[PDB]
Design a protein around this nucleic acid. Structure first.
Ligand SMILES: NC(=O)CC[C@H](N)C(=O)O
Ligand SMILES: [Cs+]
Ligand SMILES: [Cs+]
Ligand SMILES: [Cs+]
Ligand SMILES: [K+]
Ligand SMILES: [K+]
Ligand SMILES: [K+]
Ligand SMILES: [K+]
Ligand SMILES: [Mg+2]
Ligand SMILES: [Mg+2]
Ligand SMILES: [Mg+2]
Ligand SMILES: [Mg+2]
Ligand SMILES: [Mg+2]
Ligand SMILES: [Mg+2]
Length: 94
RNA sequence: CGUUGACCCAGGAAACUGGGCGGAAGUAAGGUCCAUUGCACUCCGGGCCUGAAGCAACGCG
């Protein structure tokens, strides 16, 4: 939401983009900010235009957040929040 | 779809078994047109057009 999460929630994503290449482009732009646990993207009716990237450390998520906030990606301005709830791996990876 | 195999994973002392992995399907995916600004982590909106593939080989449609 607005409380620092390992995982950022991105939206206003250009839905015209194919799935894997939407990752590929996302994973590159963001891996700069730190180790990246995974990137989830569905093009379903209600999951499209949105991506979850999960970082190892919280600080990576935080830095990725404000730095990239509101920038144009594929001709559309990203909106970034902290994700409302922790991504699954965070537990599973224990 | 069948047979004989490769490789990964789970179980098993093992033999092997299951999945990954085939005619799958007008599915995935692609173009367009509509509709959606959507908080998820076991697919998964609709129309038209186009349209695949198991990892290898052979056999069969
Ligand atoms: N998809 C398939 O069933 C492939 C069969 C084909 N005859 C082959 O040997 O590869
Ligand atoms: Cs085994
Ligand atoms: Cs198999
Ligand atoms: Cs469509
Ligand atoms: K048996
Ligand atoms: K098989
Ligand atoms: K088969
Ligand atoms: K399409
Ligand atoms: Mg064993
Ligand atoms: Mg087997
Ligand atoms: Mg077989
Ligand atoms: Mg489709
Ligand atoms: Mg259709
Ligand atoms: Mg073949």
């Amino acid at each position: 939401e607005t409380r620092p999460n390992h995982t950022i929630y991105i939206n206003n994503l250009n839905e015209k983009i194919k799935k894997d290449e939407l990752k590929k482009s996302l994973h590159a732009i963001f891996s700069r900010f730190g180790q990246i646990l995974d990137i989830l993207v569905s093009r379903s009716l209600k999951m499209r235009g949105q991506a979850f990237v999960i970082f190892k450390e919280v600080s990576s998520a935080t830095n990725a957040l404000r730095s990239m906030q509101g920038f144009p990606f594929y001709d559309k301005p990203m909106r970034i929040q902290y994700a409302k709830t922790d991504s699954d791996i965070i537990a599973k990876m224990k």
